[model samples]
Target chain A: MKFGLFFLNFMNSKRSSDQVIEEMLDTAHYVDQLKFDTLAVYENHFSNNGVVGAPLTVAGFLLGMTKNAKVASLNHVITTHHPVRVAEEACLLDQMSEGRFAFGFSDCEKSADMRFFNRPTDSQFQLFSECHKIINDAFTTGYCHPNNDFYSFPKISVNPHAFTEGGPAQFVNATSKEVVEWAAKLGLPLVFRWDDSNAQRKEYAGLYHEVAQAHGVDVSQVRHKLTLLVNQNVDGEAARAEARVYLEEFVRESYSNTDFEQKMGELLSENAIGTYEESTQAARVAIECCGAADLLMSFESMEDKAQQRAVIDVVNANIVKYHS
Target chain B: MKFGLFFLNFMNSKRSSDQVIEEMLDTAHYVDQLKFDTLAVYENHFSNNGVVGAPLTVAGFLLGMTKNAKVASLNHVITTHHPVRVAEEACLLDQMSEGRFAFGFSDCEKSADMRFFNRPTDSQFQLFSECHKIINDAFTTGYCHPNNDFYSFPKISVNPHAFTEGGPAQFVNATSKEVVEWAAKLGLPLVFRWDDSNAQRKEYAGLYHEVAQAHGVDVSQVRHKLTLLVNQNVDGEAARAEARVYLEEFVRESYSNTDFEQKMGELLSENAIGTYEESTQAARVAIECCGAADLLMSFESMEDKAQQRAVIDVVNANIVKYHS
Candidate 1:
């Protein structure tokens, strides 16, 4: 399974923006050298959630800083961006990186502030559909400017063209069974969490192909993402000691439950957050739990610098040693 | 006067896009280390001109490739961009660059394909006016969604906030007398070309501040850009010998008149497009022709890798040696 990064930019506000950006750059360079394939970013508006906007703008720069990593806006929030502008910027990035780029579409704007993007919720799906056509057209035929009820873009004479032939790989994110089927119809691989039981997960996987069959296509081979809620560790006690409270809080924030004194605590120790003896093994088990080829991962649950340093070091040392 | 490298990316259809982009990154690094302050980019749609779309996207990555130089989108056509997206990307660049970035506005859509942007000529000025305000608001206030007769936007809550205080510096280009007045009234620095006779150049300068003073803003101390047609060279013979034909053709294409033998031959010696002995002196003459505080330059005439290497080397050897 390939590895990627999912940014929540969840470092708390107390740290200066520069510090957080610096850490991200450092981490990006580190992972690139480690041969991490993709580094995806998040978008939240006026977000305490993370670096809230312009993922492509940042990802473009990230490409320049690294050698091997293919930078992506895991899913650019299409509802928030002008589709034409999205087409233009994504193409620019694809060119600069010599096609070392990917663009994912996300209409999964779960914030009330999405209203600020002027793309109303009622019409967003339609807008997404139109934008999909627009972005694809720009990449493939070098014919973008679509004048529809949703948007009007200028015609291309020269650019916003992709460097890679037939364009960079584009994917759509799916969080529900419905989206999986829909994305399958669109012939796209779905990005969803592997939080469900193996049977339930297998069922969703089946439906994705079933839809593709109905559409006269075969997406049965398309890979689905299975994010491991793996956090690197020193010792369960070292973790539960000073940064322990923070880890459990993060686990709850991610899984929506407390862990320290409950089943969550045990589950986390055994299954979620791990240590010098644990994380890579836990992550490997998760990837192997589902067909390894069928599941891709992006590590999550560590945000603070000290924890990041510890967890990242732990991840680095054991991931290749064990997973490989 | 501060200097900048303006990209026309105006090579005809001979060079591959990857080759050009690779060369641009190489050139960008070369200049940044050379301590050129602003690395400026241009925009054109589906260009016969070159990679003409999305400057901010390109500029963002250019920033990561360099430790020092500030990158600017010397001319992002306001009409073709969604105001909010432009605001968001520019702010994103500013944050990622730590304020070592700049953005400028342009309305120079000489192409008829602009109708696709859906901005009618009659109301384009109003649209530009609205966008300017919208862009500023998104940066300073983290609020955008302007509802006017021409367009409407969503109230953004999570993104578009700038990392730098008051955001990146904004400038507007002016080629006509009316635009000079408008840019001055808006209190923005005006960037106009140095392509006219001495008397005409002085009059335009006078009118820029005259309007600023009329608006109660003393822009006499303001920096106006004078884009000298300058390049480094060995001699007029070296410039005109084998490559001389290309130079003359470039001039005619830029001016839409007699290119090589007629108008260009007349222009090559008089303007800043000259060798070490000539370009700096010609440029100095243009500056004295008008009280221009800033000089703008876009490299034209040479597009091939060899020509670029030769010209850039000439620039390195002579610009500081001669001008400084």
Candidate 2:
């Protein structure tokens, strides 16, 4: 299994927003030095969960900063942008990074996010699907001519088609079974969110492969990435305590209106918070049970730099064990 | 007068598209090492004039690659993208570059470019004007709530507000007298395109100051940038001959649908092509006659590396002389 660091770019009252961004950049440098396989960033805005609004632009900066790791948007909200523009920027990033760029797309769940950009929330799924097709066509064929209900245009080609032969690596942020099956049929990989339950993760992985296999796709070539909230320290009890405090604050800030107390309970229960040995063992079990080919470690719950550094060091030391 | 390099990222028959991009990147590195004031890039796509469809993304990469020079878009097409999206990405670039990012806006001219993005051409200036207002509000106040015929949205704030106190440096790509006056009234700087005459350039500068003064804007703080085509070599005769051949082919490729032969004649008359001393003298005369505060050197016609490097060397050596 390959290892990647997932940055939520979480903002809290303790630090300035720019300071959080700087910390993210500093952590990216550390992760690149350790030779991680990928550096994934969340595309969040107008909320405390994350501060990054333009993930692709931030990804471009990350790609320029790091040398080895693929810089990726954990998910780009495709509903708000024109497909041609997205495709062009993706290809440009791919070319600039010399084929070390990957991106995922989501239909976007927040109505505020959609309305802010003048996109209607009701037709987001259709728009997202159409944008996906247009982007795929532009990357492979170097041209897109979409005549659809949402967008219609004449045949147009974006410059700097793709650095790789086929296209840049693309993923679907599969939140529903329908999307999972659609992505599977198209041979796109999946990025499953942190669900706090291994049973659901395994079911999603199984469902993904079943759909791909039945559709005559090369199942072995497909990979699913699993996101896990993790933290570590020498004192296991202290680790759990610190994690609980940070996560409660984060969830309260991010989901204040959505039954955040219950949400915090679920988040606190599933997070791997303990000493390095304990956290690593818990991560290994989750990965094996979920059948994940890639592991994305989220340190959003760990506000302490020492805790963050501890987990990074421990994870790098034991990354290969997750494969077993 | 400050010196800056403007890259059209021109595509031609002699080289591959990717090769042209690499040359641009190499040239960016050279310019950055010399500590130029700015390195500007154009946003052109679906045509041979330029290959960059997303100037802000390219500018982000350019900022990551360079340390000294500010990277700016010659102009971003404001008619195609959401104002919120543009403002967020611009702020991201500004933050990433530590306030070294700058950008300009243009109501795109090509119908194909507009239609490809599914934006209507009928109300371009209206859309452009609205977008500019939204973006300016977002930069200065960190919030945009535009309510108009084209777009009506509730109050929303973008993440990562401008790195600089007021905002990132902004310019208007003024192509008409009306636009020049509009930008002047807003106290925005003007970027005048290359025309084959010093007399017109002087008129534009004079008109800009007059409009700004009438609008109660400080004319002393206002500046206009003049674009000038330039190429240099040791042999003045060979330099002029080579420039003619290159400019003819470039104009023929870029303006095939227009009266390209006449366009070539105008381009041939205006470009400064001669020995280093002769070209330097011409650039000085143009700058003085035009009353320009900044000179943007366009080398789209120079195909050979030797010619490109010769102009760069000559310009750097004589950059201070232009001020005199």
Candidate 3:
């Protein structure tokens, strides 16, 4: 199974920004050493709540730090960027990293944030469609000139050698049936949150295949997120206890990363949180039940950087590092 | 003296993209090793001419490779990005690199590229004026809400941490007296191309000092891009011979990088193309006549990677590497 990791804090206000970035950069290489396929960065902006601002820009830093891991933009917000510019940045990363760039962008679910770009919630479809095509055309044809519903651009070509293939593997988040179907039709990978229930998993799996069949595309061509999230500490009890507390807080604060989930609220789709041994079992069960190929093990936020990294190390030690 | 370098084409179509990026990466560290204060990456986009579409994004990669040298964005055009995204990306680099972020942005002179963003040329001033403020406010106050001529956003807080105190040390290009005066008024440094001429050297030097005085800013507060273009080989005769031809072609193609000199139509820029022994004289002359503090030694286009690297090494060996 493929594996990746994302951040819950490195952008915390408690620590110096430099310190956080340094620790994260160091840990990212460690993740690579631990055999992770992708290392993603957060694009959290403002309020020390989520520290990362631009995942796409920082991806170059991660690529520079790691030798093999694909620096993935967990999901750079589409509302905050120019599509042609997005295409150019992706192409730059792909070329610099020799095609290990993984581009993930999603519509901002927060209407307040969406309004910053003057984008309505419904505009995700038009924005994503136009922007995705603009980026695609830039990468494949070396032309950035786009005349679309959402934006119009001059016939200027871009440079820094954009990659047309094998790199900048493009991805999008899909939470609704319509969005999932759209992704399937386009043969784009789906990257929605995961749940533990057999019912929800089956619902998504069924819909994916159904959409692929309708589109006359092979079901296997439909890339799925197949994600499982958990919080782990080397100490199983501490991990579980802390994770429970963390989840309680997360629910109360109404962690507003996406509109779909925030609107849906926390569910029995509870993420596994515990010591390495316990969380490992929960993750395994979760993965097995979901029939997932790509596994993601994340952590609950901790004020201490050491604690944060320790949990990450514990997860990797149990799932990946020790195997070698 | 502060020193930085930009690529004529590390994203050159003739060389393999992998090779180009690798060479550039190596060269950036080489600059660091040479104790240069700044290293710049070009934001050339589209059609394989210059290749780097997002100089800010890739600056992260360069920052990752170097320890002490500040990674500078030679130029990030304001016409193609959201100010919020720009603010976030700059902060990301600043945090990650520990203040080694040198952000240089410019107005889009080429409307063909601007029309892609649907921006007209005259809009460059207003856009830069407003967007620049938004970025500044976000970096300083942790907010990105901009009430400006072009955009007005909600008073949203930004995170992932921003660096306003030290960096990213920001810059802008100055081609006209009005722009120079504006840059000076803001105490912003400048990046412009140069040639071997007492007349031009005195002109800019006097202007920088004059503008600073008018703004009640110290003349020394002005940062400038004092550039030296050259090509070199061990064989002085061959270096001169080839550089003579290369510069003529640079004229023919009307190579565009910074407004620094692209509009000037190449210059009395007799690039130091001879052997290090011979071209050292040219560089010395170029530097002396230009009245520059920091010198940017750039190369003309070369198809062969080995030859390109050889000339780069020639200069490094002769000047920068020896100092260390």
Candidate 4:
């Protein structure tokens, strides 16, 4: 089974930005030692949901620091950037890292932040559609000219083509039904947030395949990925209790003053928190049930540096448990 | 004499993008070993003049690779990016590198590329003027609310406050008389491309000081920088001959098929190409004559990676020659 790590970099006012970044970098080094498949940096702004506002910049840094892992932006906010800029930056990263780079994007749900960039919430998908085409054209054809509804640019060359033949591996966040259908139609890989309930995971996977089939896309041509909160301990109950408290605090700190506050309760229970065997079993079951080939584990909520490293160490030592 | 190296990352069809980036990273490591004070990445697109379409991302990678050198964009194209983004990325780099970050911006002279981004060239300075204030507010106050002619955004926090108290050291490109005056009036450092004639550099410096004085801005609060082509050999004549041939081809290749062809002749002669003693003496003279404390040397046209390293080694070994 393929495994990866995610760093949300959630911060509160009490934490120094320097400390958070230093910890992130150190953990990335540890992850690299374990030879993980990918290192994903979450993108968010205006709140402490994620400290990295420039996901591409941070991804570039991580790609520089690591030797083998693919460094990716968990979801670069699509509405806030020009398509050409994304195309060029992704190509540069891919080239610099020698194909050890991945690209993921989302139409961000933060309404106020979208307005800050003058992209209305209601029209974001349309904007994303045009921008996505422009980026693909640049990557595939080396030049792009868009006269679409949202953007009109004359023919321009996108320099420094990707190290990979086509481009970096691309994924789109599965946020809503319409968005999922749009991604399925385009045959893009779907990245789903993990849930404790196997029913929800199965439903999303089934709907994605159904949509892809209806749109004349072969399900085998695309991939699905799952990101889940994972922590480990020798004692199962202690791990559960600690992760629960941390999730409770993370939810309050990240969403208390925001509109996302209403979704806090749902966020607290989807984690794989237990002894090494238990956590691995939970992750394996979730990945299989969700039809996901890739599993990304989140350790950002584990504040203690040693604890973060310990979780990765446990996973590394017991790799056979998850794979078998 | 403060010294820095500039990477234009100029690419042509003959070279692979992977080779170009590998060479850049290798040279960056050498520059760090020599303990250069700054490393600047030039920002440009749509032409072979520069291959880095995303300067900040490249700078972030450089910062990650180096130990003490400050990585900066020679000038991030201001009109194409949101000020909030520049602020956030600059701060993130600053925080990540621990004050080893510098920021510079330009309105960008490529008119067609400006139009591609939907930013009119004629009114770019006006747009730059407003964006400048918004970025300053973000750095100083940690938040911004811009309602200017160019941008209107509600209050948003620019997170990850800079490692330094205020922000990264900043500069504005002196591309035109009006732009220079604006930069001077705001007490921002001015960056100028080298010219063969001392009169041009002196005149621009004089204009900047006169404008700063007229606007009641303290001249000491800002700085002036010069970026020039530099190459060296044991024999002065061979150095000049080689540089002239390289510059001829670079100008031909970069600007030949574009709207900038008329300026090709003027781009060829302003280089510090000679023996180590001669080049150092000439660089010292220019820095003193123009009242610039910092010198950024360009070796992009040299093409040979070993030749690039040779130029830097020459400078590092003869450090006292320039300073004394």
| Candidate number of the best TM-score | 2
lDDT of each: 0.66, 0.78, 0.64, 0.77
What DockQ does each prediction reach against the true complex? 0.51, 0.65, 0.62, 0.69
Question: B1-324, model 3: which lDDT tens digit per residue?
Answer: 555677645433245666667767766765577645677766655545465677887888888867887777776786556777777778778777767788888766566666656665677767767877887887777676666578875687655456548436777765556666777777877776543344555465567668778778865644467656666566655655554544543443444454535533335334454566555676676566545566676764444557876766655664555555
Tens digit per residue, CA lDDT, model 3, A1-324: 567877644333245566666667777867778767777765655544456777777788888878877778876876557766777678778877777778877766445566556665676767766777777776777676666567754676655446646336777765566666777787777665643244566576667668878888865644555555565556666655554444443443444454444422333224565565665566666655545667655543454667877666665665655555
Model 2 per-residue lDDT tens digits across residues B170-225: 88886767677778888888887775466666777778888888888886776778
TM-score of each: 0.83, 0.93, 0.86, 0.91
TM-score of 3: 0.86
Ranking, DockQ, top scorer first:
4, 2, 3, 1
Model 1, A63-171: lDDT tens digits are 8888888888766777665556677777778888887888876775464545544456776667667767777776788776677887754565336457888778877
lDDT of 3: 0.64
Model 2 CA deviation exceeding 4 Å by range: A249-258, A320-324, B118-120, B195-197, B244-246, B249-259, B320-324
- Local distance difference test, candidate 2: 0.78
Give the higher-DockQ candidate: 1 or 2: 2
- Report the CA-based lDDT of candidate 1 relative to the real structure: 0.66
